[PDB]
Design an enzyme around this catalytic site. Structure first.
Site, PDB file in Angstrom:
ATOM      1  N   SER A 146       4.134   2.908   8.105  1.00 48.82           N
ATOM      2  CA  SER A 146       3.672   1.770   7.195  1.00 48.82           C
ATOM      3  C   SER A 146       4.807   1.379   6.309  1.00 48.82           C
ATOM      4  O   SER A 146       5.582   2.075   5.956  1.00 48.82           O
ATOM      5  CB  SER A 146       2.582   2.357   6.351  1.00 48.82           C
ATOM      6  OG  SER A 146       1.459   2.523   7.075  1.00 48.82           O
ATOM      7  N   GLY A 147       4.836   0.000   6.351  1.00 49.78           N
ATOM      8  CA  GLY A 147       5.970  -0.644   5.446  1.00 49.78           C
ATOM      9  C   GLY A 147       7.209  -0.933   6.372  1.00 49.78           C
ATOM     10  O   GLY A 147       7.946  -1.464   5.889  1.00 49.78           O
TER      11      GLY A 147
ATOM     12  N   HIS B  82       0.725  -1.274   0.061  1.00 51.96           N
ATOM     13  CA  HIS B  82      -0.222  -0.015   0.010  1.00 51.96           C
ATOM     14  C   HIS B  82       0.703   1.446  -0.002  1.00 51.96           C
ATOM     15  O   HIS B  82       0.137   2.439  -0.257  1.00 51.96           O
ATOM     16  CB  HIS B  82      -1.157  -0.103   1.206  1.00 51.96           C
ATOM     17  CG  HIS B  82      -0.633   0.434   2.522  1.00 51.96           C
ATOM     18  ND1 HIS B  82      -0.233  -0.038   3.586  1.00 51.96           N
ATOM     19  CD2 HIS B  82      -0.362   1.753   2.976  1.00 51.96           C
ATOM     20  CE1 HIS B  82       0.150   0.279   4.542  1.00 51.96           C
ATOM     21  NE2 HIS B  82       0.192   1.880   4.115  1.00 51.96           N
TER      22      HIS B  82
ATOM     23  N   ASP C  58      -0.419  -7.201   1.965  1.00 51.69           N
ATOM     24  CA  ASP C  58      -0.020  -5.923   2.023  1.00 51.69           C
ATOM     25  C   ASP C  58       1.571  -6.148   1.914  1.00 51.69           C
ATOM     26  O   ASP C  58       2.180  -5.842   3.076  1.00 51.69           O
ATOM     27  CB  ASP C  58      -0.382  -5.055   3.090  1.00 51.69           C
ATOM     28  CG  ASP C  58      -0.028  -3.498   3.029  1.00 51.69           C
ATOM     29  OD1 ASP C  58       0.479  -3.341   1.896  1.00 51.69           O
ATOM     30  OD2 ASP C  58      -0.136  -2.937   3.986  1.00 51.69           O
TER      31      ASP C  58
HETATM   32  C1  LIG Z   1     -11.291  -0.684   5.700  1.00 46.85           C
HETATM   33  N1  LIG Z   1     -10.150  -1.238   5.189  1.00 46.85           N
HETATM   34  C2  LIG Z   1      -9.635  -0.327   4.235  1.00 46.85           C
HETATM   35  C3  LIG Z   1      -9.252  -1.500   6.350  1.00 46.85           C
HETATM   36  C4  LIG Z   1      -7.892  -2.114   5.833  1.00 46.85           C
HETATM   37  C5  LIG Z   1      -6.820  -0.923   5.836  1.00 46.85           C
HETATM   38  C6  LIG Z   1      -7.336   0.114   6.742  1.00 46.85           C
HETATM   39  C7  LIG Z   1      -6.835   1.343   7.194  1.00 46.85           C
HETATM   40  C8  LIG Z   1      -7.340   2.018   8.110  1.00 46.85           C
HETATM   41  N2  LIG Z   1      -6.788   3.104   8.598  1.00 46.85           N
HETATM   42  C9  LIG Z   1      -7.602   4.382   9.167  1.00 46.85           C
HETATM   43  C10 LIG Z   1      -6.567   5.575   9.390  1.00 46.85           C
HETATM   44  C11 LIG Z   1      -5.242   4.639   9.600  1.00 46.85           C
HETATM   45  N3  LIG Z   1      -4.075   5.377   9.071  1.00 46.85           N
HETATM   46  S1  LIG Z   1      -2.966   6.020   9.870  1.00 46.85           S
HETATM   47  O1  LIG Z   1      -1.835   6.624   9.158  1.00 46.85           O
HETATM   48  O2  LIG Z   1      -3.194   6.235  11.103  1.00 46.85           O
HETATM   49  C12 LIG Z   1      -2.070   4.412  10.409  1.00 46.85           C
HETATM   50  C13 LIG Z   1      -1.473   3.630   9.336  1.00 46.85           C
HETATM   51  C14 LIG Z   1      -0.616   2.284   9.987  1.00 46.85           C
HETATM   52  C15 LIG Z   1      -0.741   1.869  10.914  1.00 46.85           C
HETATM   53  C16 LIG Z   1      -0.123   0.697  11.118  1.00 46.85           C
HETATM   54  C17 LIG Z   1      -0.456   0.172  12.650  1.00 46.85           C
HETATM   55 CL1  LIG Z   1       0.623  -1.350  12.645  1.00 46.85          CL
HETATM   56  C18 LIG Z   1      -0.771   0.818  13.471  1.00 46.85           C
HETATM   57  C19 LIG Z   1      -1.705   2.001  13.139  1.00 46.85           C
HETATM   58  C20 LIG Z   1      -1.394   2.654  11.902  1.00 46.85           C
HETATM   59  C21 LIG Z   1      -1.889   3.736  11.504  1.00 46.85           C
HETATM   60  C22 LIG Z   1      -5.399   3.519   8.777  1.00 46.85           C
HETATM   61  O3  LIG Z   1      -4.517   2.522   8.408  1.00 46.85           O
HETATM   62  C23 LIG Z   1      -8.991   1.774   8.171  1.00 46.85           C
HETATM   63  C24 LIG Z   1      -9.336   0.602   7.856  1.00 46.85           C
HETATM   64  C25 LIG Z   1      -8.587  -0.318   6.882  1.00 46.85           C
END
Ligand SMILES: CN(C)[C@H]1CCc2cc(N3CC[C@H](NS(=O)(=O)c4ccc5cc(Cl)ccc5c4)C3=O)ccc21
Ligand SMILES: [Ca+2]
Ligand SMILES: [Mg+2]
Lengths: 52, 234
Positions: free
Chosen positions: B185-186, B42, B88
């Protein structure tokens, strides 16, 4: 707990059960020591080691 | 990374940072060898053109160990879906080889059976990155690390508003304000075994950051070891 279930079979890294005995092995960049248990880095900056 | 600590000199040498055209980090990666970086599929949408920086701990100073590398080939898992973030995972082959040194070393790839029974059964793993330090904040200028408890698969499924596939696992805290966050992420999720660190996860997603009743969701690297092996052999 027996073989690999008992303290990782005394292996440094990977533990496999073969013919009801422990067989140790190592990640790439490491060589199995003469005791067949420890893993010795084959060259500089082996994987998984914090630097200096 | 929300909470946790700064990675001190030499402590997180496998950390990679994907940087955009503005030389800003948007995602992490894990150094697997002189030529390959592990990352989340992603992340390959967050920027149109990117490079990989290694050996960096402070994005504000030049500490002498930093090295930028261009990407030769992007190996995205073909079964990756934006809908659920299943599969992913991606591997990057670099144009030039990484020179290992202080702050620059690969994490080990474990064997599947052993990692599942011995690494993933440990109490904790370690996650690291230059991601936000709070849900609404800015990216960290300092590389951070965080010890994250492995979470019971059942509890994880119960906590999640979305499907946790077989290619995912959960780690972190129910209520404690510590978790990965935007920009991590990643990046690496590694597990220590006898002072050797093995790659066990890829920072994937989460319902916000450090939210109550929610955990961090990580790509389950053990499910892709054969895939990684093939990706690195070409
Ligand atoms: C509905 N599907 C699409 C699911 C699968 C992918 C996904 C992502 C999110 N969100 C909501 C916002 C958040 N983004 S973030 O940048 O805050 C983020 C990004 C990666 C993370 C990774 C970990 Cl391990 C923990 C917190 C993390 C937080 C984030 O990753 C919510 C729901 C879903
Ligand atoms: Ca720097
Ligand atoms: Mg929580």
């Amino acid at each position: 707990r027996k073989l690999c279930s008992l303290d990782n079979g005394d292996c440094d890294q990977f533990c496999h059960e073969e013919q009801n005995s422990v067989v140790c092995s190592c990640a790439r960049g490491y060589t199995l020591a003469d005791n067949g248990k420890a893993c010795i880095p084959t060259g500089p900056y082996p994987c998984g080691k914090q630097t200096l | 990374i929300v909470g946790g600590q700064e990675c001190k000199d030499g402590e997180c040498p496998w950390q990679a940072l994907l940087i955009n055209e503005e030389n800003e980090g948007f995602c992490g990666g894990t150094i697997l060898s002189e030529f390959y970086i592990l990352t989340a599929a992603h992340c390959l949408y967050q920027a149109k053109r990117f490079k990989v920086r290694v050996g960096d701990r402070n994005t504000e100073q030049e500490e002498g160990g930093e090295a930028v590398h261009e990407v030769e080939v992007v190996i995205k898992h073909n079964r990756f879906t934006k809908e659920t973030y299943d599969f992913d995972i991606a591997v990057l082959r670099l144009k030039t080889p990484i020179t290992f040194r202080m702050n620059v070393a690969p994490a080990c790839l474990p064997e599947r059976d052993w990692a599942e029974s011995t690494l993933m059964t440990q109490k904790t793993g370690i996650v690291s990155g230059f991601g936000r330090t709070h849900e609404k904040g800015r990216q960290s200028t300092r590389l951070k690390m965080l010890e994250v408890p492995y979470v019971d698969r059942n509890s994880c499924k119960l906590s999640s508003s979305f499907i946790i596939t077989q290619n995912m696992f959960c780690a972190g805290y129910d209520t404690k304000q510590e978790d990965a966050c935007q920009g991590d992420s990643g990046g690496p999720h590694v597990t220590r075994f006898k002072d050797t660190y093995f790659v066990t996860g890829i920072v994937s997603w989460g319902e916000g950051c450090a939210r109550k009743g929610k955990y961090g969701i990580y790509t389950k690297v053990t499910a892709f070891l054969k895939w990684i092996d093939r990706s690195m052999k070409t």
